[PDB]
Design a protein around this ligand. Sequence first.
Ligand code: HEM
Length: 152
Amino acid sequence: GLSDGEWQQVLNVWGKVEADIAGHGQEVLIRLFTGHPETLEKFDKFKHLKTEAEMKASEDLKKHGTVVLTALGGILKKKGHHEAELKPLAQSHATKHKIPIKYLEFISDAIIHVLHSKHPGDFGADAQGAMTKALELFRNDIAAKYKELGFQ
Ligand code: HEM
């Protein structure tokens, strides 16, 4: 449950991401994969990436980063009214990709890390609070769908 002012902060922060969705998406995934190498194993199409240099050079990783952040941005712009947008992602990530909710926590924190890394001094405490709450809401609603599906 975010206030109007918190959603305003979220969407203000998101404008930073939308200016360079592929660069943000790439860095989010690289942060996820390098911080939590087990997550790489969930991607048949990225498990060949042995080094961060290879990850950085991967155009397909940037492409997927764009897909991920485009989806997330579409969800965030719903300001919590995202059941229709979230449902297929929860279902695909539980049933097809088999992504534990822990990895969604990892990527949520990776987003925060990337925002500070790319916008140092420009991702204020209020913005971090609002973005964190929005990612918690996202993760929590996914978690509810995971529970429905019995997925761990
Ligand atoms: C912000 C959180 C995430 C968003 C918005 C997101 C979004 C997406 C989207 C839109 C797709 C393609 C459509 C689909 O298959 O449903 C996808 C595919 C996929 N996602 Fe995610 N995802 C997120 C987090 C994760 C995490 C944390 C993992 C694993 C650690 C993961 C693993 C995968 C895999 C393996 C695929 C299939 C990739 C392929 O083979 O093309 N996702 N994701």
